[PDB]
């Protein structure tokens, strides 16, 4: 688990804001468990891959490509002429190891939910109640110490 | 190549909304005011030391008396603005301070943008916008402008990322 | 990385036969295309009706086929709707209507051939850009 | 509402008259020397 | 009574008033009190405004969910365009606050008064025997408010396109402007930033040179400022020592020794630069925009070789394509 | 609304503390004989 | 439960072929000789209970009927969806180049 | 609570304005 | 779109206002879209479509003439939008159509001139008033007016 | 008759024509001659919004409201056939026309209540056996009330039905079940009731006049909140002609 956890953009010190106060937990919440590795596939069995979120972007689109980087599926803005909607592609998601290990999901909404999450790397289970989190990334001590000393200097 | 640096910062860091950038401009903008305002106050508050119209020659490169009525200037502004200088030593130190302090602040703001520790959003605003679809401020509006800047630029602006954004994924309003 | 004669060799008629333009015709077309088209067809789109573009494939499925010199040329003389079931020379520049669209008066068969050649050559150079709009700018 | 229009109008006239009849009152005269 | 009106005119014009209420003032003082009073109330309690005429109210006041940074007074409706919308033009205030009536009441009174404020900056100078022209320096910042609050709207066909009265609302005006006019690529804006950057620059130059070449008359533990008394005869700094240093920093002939020529430059620069910036906004108000170098440099085959000018276009398209989500129904943005 | 709980006290002390500082001085200056 | 009727429609025939009861008129420009004249008739002539019912539009010249027969494989038909038909969205859904 | 805080500071700056214009230290000559 | 079989009179746009036709603030029928701001435009080509209540749905429905269709098309593609280097269109457009409306050239040139002249006015008027009373060359070192006035302090 | 210029800016353009006090006659129906309505027109006078008792049920009365938008309320140019029925009744069937106008009214509280005042797909009917149209010859029927905002409309955060965002992208790691309702846009479609009761006939020119009363729901805002019940009273004018 520990290893999977480092592979989550929510621990990237480069995400966050100057007035987004507090611990990283007031953001996405207290991490509870690793839901597991998510593998996306489309009707043909082909395995798709979720383009990850570069630290630079506050918000990023859900795009899925195969090994060769060919766009195979995505979540459309204007549906008027969408060619890759998860619906038209029969995208599905399966998990291995973790909370959701061995399970598969096929109802578009649920698949997209997780796809929408894959973007940040390994998908986790947070406790948002306790700290009354808001779901907006905050930076780590590594980040604050760095900001403070670069300024003082 | 610098204008894109500007557009980038708006789009990605929402830099215009940063307290430090604001101070920055308040200083540069406010500094370019002292500059203009003081200059004019001097040229139109001058004593007559010549018989010509072009009063430039009428100046004593070798000190002595004040070349402009500091006393008159004081009364002018004191009656048109309500406040007015009256200590050239301070009026001039102020002129050093304003724009140097401004630029210092604009720097700190960027030293923070290095770590991406930006002043991107107002959480209370976002939360209300989520639950209530009819709440709209000039702020929310802007954030959408950013989304467009990021989505339509990222591709040819960050080549090393081999970005491919299908036409259907590109955020766009109606018709445009 | 250059505009060779190859890039200039485009389909002349429906029966596969081709013609090869010369760097002179090309430039000349490009100039004429600006003189009487860009106004509304800048970059291969169509401002007063964005649904129909100048992409070669679009012209291929047109009716009759307008994806070859012969085709486009006919069109510039007697324009029709995408199904060809209706002549539109009255609201579209053409030779049979130069009285209404003066810019089309000078235009001679030599000129019409160049304009046509340009339309088939551009997408060959620009590619996707030519058809699509601002998305590709 | 039709009233407010009237009032506003009156009010603006006052001041605009006060303004014209002002500079008219030999304004050049008012100043330190030559007049 | 030497004659009431005769007296009135003597008071108004009196140079013994704490604040010089002038002839221009008689118009200024009221218009400015209305603009200010309406604003403050608006900004604090006004309700949502259908700025884009598409029945999609934008609330910009504190009491309706805004904070100082986001809050603003929203521009009159687009349904209204350039039509005059005085309160007496509405079935009710409720209707007037919804179509952004307060905006006009404010911009018009402000622009009116801020002009007289200029007219006054002349008058007092006259009643005091000092040369005019200060008011001409103030013509630049004014000529901007005008460009941003009136020219641009006249040019664009609606007051709804004028700059909003608020922090974020202004950034909106900017970001969109750039998208529709590509201002950063316009000579006039550039001259504008030269004047502003330059101003701040020079403001610092003068400020330091002078302050650094002050004649000692103060203790080691006494504010160096006290070394000056209001109403001095001679100067308080060695303008010859100042020039001596600055002439050596760069080179002699590239340095001022004439305080009058120094101060003219000091005023001339920013004012001239801002004049151009104001003419930029007043010019791009008729759609004569910045340089368009999109797809200029192309290679030997015809391929398009991008320049930074193109990377700028993408960022502009993002703005174009996303501003006013629901306001457009057609292909070209001609408004 | 959904604001920060400490925002109020952060703003209050941010204004009070330094203002109280200046004021303490000004008054002690102001009351210095001669 | 709550669902986006449109994103759901994309999981049916609509989304794979030209829907005679929903798809916007411009969709007909991807096949030879259907656009102007026929697409107007198809759209103008309300919904269809089966693709073939299109062959039944009153007035269709013998040639038009021919063409239609040829492209039927590119058509389908699904319940009329309001979100997609209201607003005259089938003649202009706000998309251009 | 926030509105009150924003208006208060504003109200405080205007008060300052007043005192600054009408209760400055009279500016004395020579 | 009317030719494609759309009923302009009842078409509802994204906002629910009227894709093609809507009403002005005083009740008249005008064109819809951002163009609602120009409902004061009158012109030979467009007038024959206007009724006593503004655009008449019957004339629009069957009296539109070809010369008008091409007039509207011509003018649509020749709006007064362009760049300094004369590239007709919107700032994001591509090079090709070298054009900038004479109306744009004239209007800008004359606003600049008109402006600077207003400065010219202020400047020469300010000089004349000081010249007359006679102090446009400086304050009389000796008789400094301000110095004879009571302190407002 | 008055030209455009003779009306522009008077507000007169948003007023259905009127018949004089004289015209109180009766128009004849051939029952063997098709008839149509060359021009139906509806002008609102009042918009009442039924209130809510809260927890304690005490019935809910419609209340007046201020018109916050302006004189853009009228429906005009309505048209369709006025087929005569076997039992001798008449049913109007609309085809096309400026059959809807987005209206917005405020309330006691200050709440803006937007509605899509319409009569789309009207199907009005009269009494059986109606040889000639006399004063007060009630027309009653239903119409359709489509969603206020159409498929493409995007909320302040970019979310939309036919287009726009999938969720609250401003809160990347927030729980979603709570935001469900505001992220998933729904397109509402409902029925409406209206009754056009004549007051002035004029068999001469075949142009009747009167007053109407219709009820419908207001904007539910892409289904984010409940719609308010609305009642609308005004006047109408119809032009009957053989055709
Ligand atoms: C306080 C003190 C204040 C002092 C103030 C002093 C102010 C002085 C102001 C001076 C001058 C103002 C000049 C305005 C110039 C406008 C030039 C122009 O419209 O020019 C138009 C042309 C055209 O460019 C061409 O435009 C062309 C094409 O247009 C088109 O052509 C195509 C076919 O070729 C198609 O037909 C297409 O559709 C059509 O649009 C092509 O794209 C070309 O490739 C492209 O090169 O300009 C070019 O080439 C331009 C190359 C320009 C470099 C410009 C620099 C400008 C300003 C710099 C200012 C620095 C200031 C520093 C100040 C510091 C302190 C104050
Ligand atoms: C506010 C805005 C005000 C705008 C005023 C605009 C123009 C006033 C122009 C008088 C212009 C004479 C222009 C000219 O003869 O223009 C000639 C050309 C025109 O080029 C031609 O432009 C032509 C076309 O324009 C037009 O032609 C098209 C069809 O071809 C369309 O009709 C279009 O609408 C129309 O405008 C064609 O494209 C040609 O092929 C092309 O060659 O451009 C040029 O000259 C560009 C010159 C640039 C000079 C840059 C100077 C930079 C720095 C100077 C610093 C001085 C500092 C002093 C400091 C002192 C103290 C500090
Ligand atoms: C020197 C570096 C330093 C650093 C890096 C941190 C970092 C952190 N602290 Mg500590 N802290 C420090 C010093 C420091 N602290 C000191 C000296 C104290 C005692 C006074 C505290 C007391 C403290 C508490 C009580 C708490 C923290 C908490 C936290 C974490 C908060 C997360 C956050 O959102 O920050 C927010 C960061 C900011 C708001 C910085 C912005 C400053 C701006 C607003 C103003 C500059 C003002 C000036 C007037 C500007 C212009 C002037 C003009 C003249 C030019 C974070 C890891 C919290 C925690 O541990 O949660 C689990 C918590 O509860 N800290
Ligand atoms: C509206 C007013 C406004 C104002 C007043 C400012 C003001 C400022 N901005 Mg913003 N900005 C704005 C709007 C505004 N901005 C908007 C709308 C955006 C987009 C959202 C931005 C985006 C932005 C960014 C991204 C940045 C700024 C920065 C800055 C500051 C730069 C400091 C400087 O002058 O460079 C200082 C320049 C130097 C030190 C170089 C001097 C070199 C000298 C010694 C020699 C030159 C000599 C040479 C050899 C001579 C030959 C030259 C040759 C070409 C001929 C400054 C305070 C910068 C900043 O924050 O910095 C901390 C920054 O990075 N701004
Ligand atoms: C780090 C270095 C750096 C440098 C050198 C520049 C330089 C420049 N910027 Mg830039 N800028 C920077 C950083 C920098 N910037 C940053 C970080 C930002 C924010 C991201 C910007 C944002 C920005 C904007 C928005 C704009 C500029 C513009 C300009 C030009 C302005 C000219 C002016 O009036 O300046 C003040 C300087 C002077 C008055 C003195 C002139 C100095 C130079 C030109 C000549 C020196 C000559 C020589 C060495 C001495 C004589 C020798 C003798 C023997 C002949 C100038 C070339 C403007 C532009 O594009 O104009 C066309 C503009 O609009 N900049
Ligand atoms: C954008 C930055 C910028 C600002 C904010 C600014 C501001 C100001 N400049 C003034 C003066 C000047 N500025 C000058 C040169 C310059 N000024 C510059 C840049 C700026 N100058 C630059 C770059 C230059 C060099 C060219 C000169 C030469 C002067 C002056 O002579 C003048 C002055 O007197 O300085 C001492 C002041 C005039 C006050 C007045 O008459 O109020 C009138 C109203 C008052 C006081 C209170 C009532 C407020 C009511 C009317 C407001 C209603 C709402 C507004 C209309 C909305 C605007 C607010 C926005 C946030 C939306 C004012 C504080
Ligand atoms: C409830 C409601 C309505 C609330 C709010 C409404 C609202 C919109 C409020 C907006 C305000 C707001 C939030 C602003 C944000 C900006 C802000 C507060 C930033 C603060 C932080 C900041 C910039 C810090 C440092 C940077 C800095 C030094 C800025 C300086 C700015 C500044 C004072 C510029 C000077 C402007 C000016 C008028 C100078 C005049 C100088 C003087 C009077 C000239 C007269 C004069 C000239 C002579 O030459 C001579 C010789 C003499 C003798 C003489 O006298
Ligand atoms: C009716 C009034 C209508 C408008 C009134 C305007 C009031 C202007 C207030 C300026 C007071 C300046 C002052 O007294 O300091 C006075 C001092 C200068 O005072 C100097 O003091 C020196 C010793 O330190 C020496 O004694 C000098 O002789 C003396 O001149 O500071 C200044 O110089 C002020 C210049 C700074 C520019 C003012 C910027 C105004 C911004 C205010 C914040 C706005 C808030 C907006 C909220 C929304
Ligand atoms: C081909 C045709 C082209 C036409 C082009 C027109 C140019 C006209 C320019 C205006 C002339 C100015 C004037 O009369 O003011 C007269 C005064 C008095 O000066 C002075 O003149 C005095 C004499 S008298 O009293 O004025 O008679 C003298 O005693 C004093 O020492 C001396 O400084 O001068 C100024 O302060 C204005 C200076 C202008 C700026 C120039 C500086 C150049 C370098 C710039 C550096 C930055 C680079 C920027 C690059 C873009
Ligand atoms: C597109 C058109 C471009 C227009 C450019 C206009 C440039 C105007 C420059 C004036 C700056 C205004 C600064 C006020 C500053 C001020 O008061 O000093 C004004 C100063 C003259 O001062 P004087 O004491 O000599 O005035 C008395 C007599 O000389 C008669 O004027 O102007 C100049 O040196 C000439 C500049 C013209 C060359 C340009
Ligand atoms: Mn505020 Ca100038 Mn982008 Mn059309 Mn609207
Ligand atoms: Ca209610
Ligand atoms: Fe000075």
- What is the 3 state secondary structure string of chain G? CCCCHHHHHCCCCECCEEECCCCCHHHHHHCCCCHHHHHHHHHHCCCCCCHHHHHHCCCCCHHHHHHHHHHHHHEECCCCCHHHHHHHCCCCCCCCC
Quick check: J72 and J100 in contact, CB under 8 A?
no
**E171 C-alpha vs ligand 4 centroid, how far in Å?**
17
Residue matched to tokens 């009196």: E14
Measured from CB, residues less than 6 Å from any atom of ligand 8 are B 82-83, 85-87, 90; H 10, 13, 17, 20-21
User: Ligand 13 centre and the CA of C44: distance in Å?
Assistant: 60
Query: Which among I57, I64, I63, I12 is positioned nearest to J77, based on CA atoms?
Result: I57
Q: Please list, in sequence order, all residues whose beta carbon lies within 8 angstroms of the beta carbon of residue A75, skipping any fewer than 6 positions away.
A: A61, A62, A85, A86, A112, A115, A116, B169, J166
User: A34 CA to middle of ligand 8, Å?
Assistant: 60
Give the mutation candidate from J100, J143, J145, J162 for the G interface (greatest G CB count, under 10 A). Answer: J162
Helix, strand or coil for residue B70? helix
Total domains in the fold of chain C: 1
Closest residue by Cα to atom 43, ligand 9, is E254
- Å between I80 CA and nearest CA of chain C: 13
Cβ neighbours of residue C133 closer than 8 Å, sequence gap 6 or more: C43, C45, C50, G96, G97
Q: Which residues of I touch J99 (CB under 8 A)?
A: 9-10
Residues in CB range of J133: below 8 A, 6 or more apart: J26, J27, J29, J90, J198, J201, J203, J208, J240
Give the distance from residue E100's alpha carbon to the nearest chain I alpha carbon, in angstroms: 14
Q: Cα dist. A9→A123, B8, B58, E189 in Å? A: 10, 22, 70, 40
Which residues does chain G have within 8 Å of residue B169's beta carbon, measured at their own beta carbons? none
Backbone angles phi, psi at E278, to 5 degrees: -65, -35
Can you spell out the DSSP letters for E1-27?
---HHHHHHHHHT-TTSSS---TTHHH
Query: How far apart are the CA of E161 and the centre of ligand 11, in A?
Result: 7
Q: Which residues, listed in sequence order, are joined to residue A48 by a DSSP beta bridge?
A: A40
For E315, the enclosing helix (H) or strand (E) is helix E308-322
- What is the CB-side half-sphere exposure of residue B48 using CA atoms within 13 A? 18
E160: CB partners within 8 A, 6+ apart: E51, E52, E53, E75, E76, E77, E78, E80, E81, E100, E153, I37
> CA torsion, points B90, B95, B100, B101, in degrees to nearest 10?
60
| Distance of alpha carbon G13 from alpha carbon G20, whole angstroms | 11
DSSP3 helix / strand / coil % (chain C, rounded to 5): 50, 5, 45
Sequence-distant (≥ 6) Cβ neighbours of residue F28 within 8 angstroms: none
Nearest chain A residue (CA) to J177: A113
> Does residue A136 line the site of ligand 3, with CB under 6 A?
no
User: I71: domain range?
Assistant: 1-79
**DSSP characters over chain J:** ---GGGTTTTSGGGS-----SS----EE--SSS--EEEEEEEEEEEEEEE----SS-----EEE-EE-S-S---EEEEEEE-PBPTTS-BEEEEEEEE-EEEEEEE-SSS-EEEEEEE-EEEEEE--S--SEE-SS--EEEEEEEE-SS-TT---TTSB-SSSSBSS-TTSTTS-STTTHHHHS----EEEEEEEEEEEE--TTTTEEEEEEEEEEE---TTTTSPPPEEEEEEEEEEEEE--
Interface test mutation site (partner F, options B19, B121, B122, B124, max chain F beta carbons within 10 A): B124
* Shortest alpha-carbon distance between residue G8 and chain C (Å): 26
Per-residue tokens: I67: 């010369």
E strands within chain C?
A: 9-11, 18-20
Cα separation, E190 vs E276, whole angstroms: 9
Q: What is the helix (H) or strand (E) element at residue E105, kind and residue range?
A: helix E101-127
B/e letters for C57-75, b = 16+ CB within 10 Å, e = fewer, are ebbebbbebbbbbbbbbbb
Instruction: Residue F1: list chain B partners with CB under 8 A.
Output: 124, 128
CA distance I87 to chain D (A): 47
Burial grade of A152 (CB within 10 A; 0-12, 13-18, 19 or more): exposed
Nearest residue of chain I to residue B66 (CA atoms)? I141
How many CB atoms neighbour CB J26 within 10 A?
15
Residues H4, H8, H14, H19: what is their CA dihedral angle, to the nearest 10 degrees? 160
How far apart (Å, rounded) are the C-alpha atoms in residues E30 and E238? 46
G82 in contact with I, Cβ within 8 Å: no
Q: Whose CA is nearest to atom 2 of ligand 11?
A: E335
Question: What are J41's strand-pairing partners?
Answer: J237
Dist CA C121 CA C9 (whole Å) = 8
Return the residue whose CA atom lies nearest to atom 1 of ligand 7. Answer: H7
| E187 lies within 8 A of chain B by CB | no
Q: How far apart are CA A54 and CA J50, in angstroms?
A: 51
Residues of chain J with Cβ-Cβ distance to I28 below 8 Å are: 4, 7-8, 13-14
Determine if residue B12 is labeled as part of a ligand binding site.
no
Task: Look at residues J112, J107, J83, J97 and name the one whose alpha carbon lies nearest to residue J236.
Answer: J97
Spatial distance between the Cα atoms of J38 and J45, rounded to a whole number of angstroms: 23
Rounded to whole angstroms, the Cα distance separating E103 from E99 reads 9
The residue length of chain A stands at: 153
E284 alpha carbon – ligand 1 mean position (Å): 15
On whether the CB atoms of residues E132 and E266 are closer than 8 A, the answer is no
Domains of chain J and CATH, by start: 21-149+186-243 (2.40.160.30), 150-185 (3.30.2050.10)
Q: From residue B173, give the alpha-carbon distance in Å to each of A60, F31, G96, J164.
A: 17, 66, 12, 8
Q: Is B47 helix (H, G, I), strand (E, B) or coil?
A: strand
Does the beta carbon of D5 lie under 8 angstroms from any beta carbon of chain E?
yes
Contact G89 J151 (CB under 8 A): yes
CA dist D31 and D23 (Å) reads 13
Report CA-CA distances (Å) from B155 to A120, B5, B8, B167, E318.
20, 15, 13, 12, 12
Q: What is the largest CA-CA distance in chain A?
A: 57
DSSP 3-state of I89: coil
Scanning the structure block, which residue is given the tokens 């603009």? E35
Cα separation, I81 vs C47, in Å, equals 15
Secondary structure of residue E36 in the 3-state scheme: helix
Cβ-defined contact of J4 to I7 (cutoff 8 Å):
no
Residue G32: C-alpha distances to residues E231, G68, G74 (Å): 92, 10, 12
- With an 8 Å CB cutoff and a minimum of 3 pairs, decide whether chains G and E touch: yes
**Cα–chain-centroid distance for residue E111?**
11
The ligand 3 atom nearest the CA atom of A20? 34
**Distance (Å) from the C-alpha of residue B94 to the closest C-alpha of chain E?**
7
* CATH code, domain carrying C64: 1.10.760.10
Q: Which of F26, E306, D15, I131 is nearest to B155 (CA)?
A: E306
B167: exposed, middle or buried (C-beta count within 10 Å: 0-12, 13-18, 19+)? middle
Ligand of minimum distance to the alpha carbon of E178: 4
Only one residue has tokens 């174009």, namely E320
Which numbered atom of ligand 10 lies nearest the CA of B43? 17
The helix (run of H) or strand (run of E) holding residue E43 is helix E25-45
Largest Cα–Cα distance of chain G, in whole Å?
Answer: 48
Look at chain I and count its residues. 153
CA distance B63 to B49: 13
Residue E49 in 3-state DSSP?
A: strand
Whether residues G29 and C82 touch (CB distance < 8 A) is answered with yes
Q: Where are the alpha helices (DSSP H) in E152-225?
A: 152-156, 167-181, 187-212
Residue for token pair 């500079």: D23
> And the tokens for J78?
């309505």
- Residue J145's DSSP bridge partners are J190
G1-86: CATH topology = DNA polymerase; domain 1 (1.10.150)
CA E282 to chain centre: 13
Tell me how close the Cα of G66 comes to any Cα of chain A, in angstroms: 28
* Contact list, G94 vs chain E (CB under 8 Å): 328-329
Q: How far apart are CA A31 and CA A44, in angstroms?
A: 35
Give the residue, by CA position, lying nearest to ligand 1 atom 55. E187
CA distance G49 to G20: 10
**What is the Cα–Cα distance from E292 to E309, expressed in whole angstroms?**
8
- Choose among A55, C130, A82: nearest CA to B154: A55
Closest CA to A72 of A44, A95, A111: A44
Containing domain of residue C12, as a range? 1-137
Which ligand 11 atom lies nearest to the CA of residue E335? 4
- For F7, the closest chain B residue by CA position comes to B124
| Contact assignment for I33 to E53 by CB distance below 8 Å | no
Given CB atoms, is D10 within the 8 Å cutoff of chain E? no
Q: Which two tokens stand for residue B103?
A: 């630029």
Q: Which chains touch G (3 or more CB pairs under 8 A)?
A: A, B, C, E, I, J
> Rounded to whole angstroms, how far apart are CA atoms J92 and J124?
5
I50: left (phi > 0), else alpha (psi -120 to 50), else beta? beta
- Give the tokens for residue G89: 């969205």
Residue E230 belongs to what domain range? 1-335
Tell me which DSSP letter residue C38 carries: I
């Amino acid at each position: 688990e520990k290893l999977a956890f480092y592979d989550y953009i929510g621990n990237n010190p480069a995400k966050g804001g100057l007035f987004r106060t507090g611990p990283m937990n007031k953001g996405d919440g207290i991490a509870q468990a690793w839901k597991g590795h998510a593998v996306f596939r489309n009707k043909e069995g082909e395995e798709l891959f979720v383009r990850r979120m570069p630290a630079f972007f506050e918000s990023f689109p859900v795009i899925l490509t195969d090994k060769n980087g060919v766009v195979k599926a995505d979540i459309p803005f204007r549906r008027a002429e969408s060619k890759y909607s998860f619906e038209q592609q029969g995208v599905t998601v399966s998990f291995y190891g973790g909370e959701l290990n061995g399970q598969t999901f096929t109802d578009p909404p649920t698949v997209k939910s997780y796809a929408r999450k894959a973007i940040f790397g390994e998908i986790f289970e947070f406790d948002t109640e306790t700290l009354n989190s808001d779901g907006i990334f905050r930076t780590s001590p590594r980040g604050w110490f760095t900001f403070a000393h670069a300024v003082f200097a | 190549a610098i204008f894109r640096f500007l557009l980038f910062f708006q789009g990605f860091h929402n830099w215009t909304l940063n307290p430090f950038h604001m101070m920055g401009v308040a200083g540069v903008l406010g500094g370019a005011l002292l500059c203009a305002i003081h200059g004019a106050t001097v040229e139109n508050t001058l004593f007559q030391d010549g018989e010509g119209a072009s009063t430039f020659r009428a100046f004593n490169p070798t000190q002595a008396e004040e070349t402009y009525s500091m006393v008159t200037a004081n009364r002018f502004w004191s009656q048109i603005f309500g406040i007015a200088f009256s200590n050239k030593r301070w009026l001039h130190f102020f002129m050093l301070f304003v724009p140097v302090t401004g630029l210092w602040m604009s720097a700190i703001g960027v030293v923070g943008l290095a770590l991406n520790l930006r002043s991107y959003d107002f959480i209370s605003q976002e939360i209300r916008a989520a639950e209530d679809p009819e709440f709209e401020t000039f702020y929310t509006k802007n954030l959408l402008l950013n989304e467009g800047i990021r989505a339509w630029m990222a591709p040819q602006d960050q080549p090393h990322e081999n970005f491919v954004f299908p036409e259907e994924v590109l955020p766009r309003g109606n018709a445009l | 990385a250059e505009l060779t004669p190859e890039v200039l060799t485009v389909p002349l008629n429906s029966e596969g036969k081709t013609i090869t333009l010369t760097e002179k015709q090309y430039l000349e077309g490009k100039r004429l295309f600006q003189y009487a088209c860009a106004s509304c067809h800048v970059g291969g789109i169509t401002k007063t009706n964005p649904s129909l573009d100048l992409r070669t494939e679009t012209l291929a499925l047109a009716t009759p086929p307008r994806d070859n010199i012969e085709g486009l040329v006919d069109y510039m003389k007697n324009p029709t709707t995408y199904d060809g079931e209706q002549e539109i020379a009255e609201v579209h520049p053409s030779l049979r209507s130069a009285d209404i669209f003066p810019k089309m008066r000078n235009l001679t068969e030599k000129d019409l051939v160049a304009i046509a050649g340009h339309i088939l050559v551009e997408p060959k150079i620009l590619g996707d850009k030519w058809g699509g709009g601002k998305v590709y700018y | 509402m039709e009233t407010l229009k009237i009032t506003v109008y009156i009010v603006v006239t006052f001041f605009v008259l006060l303004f014209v009849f002002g500079f008219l009152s030999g304004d050049p005269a008012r100043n330190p020397k030559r007049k | 009574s030497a004659n009431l009106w005769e007296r009135f005119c003597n008071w108004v014009t009196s140079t013994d008033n704490r604040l010089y209420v002038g002839w221009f003032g008689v118009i200024m003082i009221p218009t400015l009190l209305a603009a200010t009073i309406c604003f403050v109330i608006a900004f604090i309690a006004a309700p949502p405004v259908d700025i884009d005429g598409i029945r999609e109210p934008v609330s910009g006041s504190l009491l309706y969910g805004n904070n100082i940074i986001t809050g603003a007074v929203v521009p009159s409706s687009n349904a209204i365009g350039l039509h005059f919308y005085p309160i007496w033009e509405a079935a009710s205030l409720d209707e007037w606050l919804y179509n952004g009536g307060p905006y006009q009441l404010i911009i018009f009174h402000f622009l009116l008064g801020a002009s007289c404020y200029m007219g006054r900056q002349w008058e007092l100078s006259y009643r005091l025997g000092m040369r005019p022209w200060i008011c001409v320096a103030y013509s630049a910042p004014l000529a901007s408010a005008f460009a941003v609050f009136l020219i641009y709207p006249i040019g664009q066909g609606s007051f709804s396109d004028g700059m909003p009265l608020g922090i974020s609302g202004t950034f909106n005006f900017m970001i969109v402007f750039q998208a529709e006019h590509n201002i950063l690529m316009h000579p006039f804006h550039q001259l504008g930033v030269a004047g502003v950057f330059g101003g701040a620059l020079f403001c610092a130059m003068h400020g330091s040179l002078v302050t650094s070449s002050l004649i000692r008359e103060t203790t080691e533990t006494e504010s160096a400022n006290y070394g000056y008394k209001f109403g001095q005869e001679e100067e308080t700094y060695n303008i010859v020592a100042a020039h001596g240093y600055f002439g050596r920093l760069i080179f002699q002939y590239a340095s001022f020794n004439n305080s009058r020529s120094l101060h003219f430059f000091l005023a001339a620069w920013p004012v001239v630069g801002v004049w151009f910036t104001a003419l930029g906004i007043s010019t791009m108000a008729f759609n004569l925009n910045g340089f368009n170098f999109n797809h200029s440099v192309i290679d030997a085959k015809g391929n398009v070789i991008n320049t930074w000018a193109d990377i700028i276009n993408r960022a502009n398209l993002g703005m174009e394509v996303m501003h006013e989500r629901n306001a457009h129904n057609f292909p070209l943005d001609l408004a | 609304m959904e604001v920060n709980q400490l925002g109020l006290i952060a703003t209050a002390l941010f204004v009070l503390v330094p203002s109280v500082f200046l004021i303490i001085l000004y008054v002690q200056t102001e009351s210095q004989q001669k | 439960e709550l669902v986006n009727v449109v994103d759901e429609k994309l999981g049916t025939a609509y989304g794979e072929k030209i829907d005679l009861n929903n798809t916007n008129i411009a969709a007909f420009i991807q096949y030879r000789g259907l656009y102007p004249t026929l697409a107007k008739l198809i759209v103008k002539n309300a919904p269809y209970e089966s693709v073939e019912d299109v062959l039944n539009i009153p007035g269709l010249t013998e040639r038009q009927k021919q063409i239609l027969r040829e492209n039927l494989e590119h058509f389908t038909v699904t319940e009329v969806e309001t979100a997609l038909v209201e607003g005259g969205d089938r003649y202009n859904n706000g998309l251009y180049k | 609570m926030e509105t009150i805080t924003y208006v208060f500071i504003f109200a405080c700056i205007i008060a300052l304005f007043f005192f600054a214009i009408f209760f400055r230290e009279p500016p004395r000559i020579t | 779109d009317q030719k494609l079989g759309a009923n302009v009179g009842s078409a509802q746009g994204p906002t629910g206002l009227g894709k093609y036709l809507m009403r002005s603030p005083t009740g008249e029928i005008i064109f819809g879209g951002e163009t609602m701001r120009f409902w004061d435009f009158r012109g030979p080509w467009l007038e024959p479509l206007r009724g006593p209540n503004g655009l008449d749905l019957n004339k629009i429905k069957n009296d539109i003439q070809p010369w008008q269709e091409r007039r509207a098309a011509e003018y649509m593609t020749h709006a007064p939008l362009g760049s300094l280097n004369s590239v007709g269109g919107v700032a994001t457009e591509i090079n090709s159509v070298n054009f900038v409306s004479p109306r744009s050239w004239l209007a800008t040139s004359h606003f600049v001139l008109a402006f600077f002249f207003l400065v010219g006015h202020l400047w020469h008027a300010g000089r004349a008033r000081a010249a007359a009373a006679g102090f446009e060359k400086g304050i009389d070192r000796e008789s400094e007016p301000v110095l004879s006035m009571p302190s407002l302090d | 008759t008055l030209t455009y210029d003779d009306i522009v800016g008077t507000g007169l353009a948003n007023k259905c024509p009127t018949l004089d006090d004289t015209a109180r006659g009766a128009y004849p129906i051939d029952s063997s001659q098709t008839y149509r309505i060359a021009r139906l027109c509806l002008q609102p006078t009042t918009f009442l919004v039924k209130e809510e008792p809260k927890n304690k049920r005490q019935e809910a009365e419609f209340v007046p409201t201020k018109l916050v938008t302006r004189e853009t309320t009228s429906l005009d140019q309505i048209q369709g056939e006025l087929k005569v029925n076997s039992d001798g009744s008449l049913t109007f069937v609309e085809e096309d026309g400026i059959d809807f106008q987005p209206v917005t009214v405020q309330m006691a509280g200050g709440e803006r209540i937007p509605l899509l005042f319409t009569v789309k797909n009207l199907v009005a009917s009269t009494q059986p056996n109606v040889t000639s149209i006399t004063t007060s010859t009630d027309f009653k029927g239903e119409f359709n009330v489509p969603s206020y905002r159409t498929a493409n409309f995007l909320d302040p955060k970019g979310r939309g039905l036919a287009s726009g965002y999938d969720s609250a992208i401003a809160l990347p790691q927030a729980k979603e079940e709570e935001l469900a309702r505001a992220n998933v846009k729904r397109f509402s479609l409902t029925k409406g009731q209206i009754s056009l009761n004549v007051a002035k006939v004029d068999g001469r020119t075949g142009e009747i006049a009167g007053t109407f009363e219709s009820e419908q729901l207001s904007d539910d805002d892409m289904g984010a909140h409940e719609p308010h019940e609305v009642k609308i009273q005004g006047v109408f004018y119809a032009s009957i002609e053989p055709a």
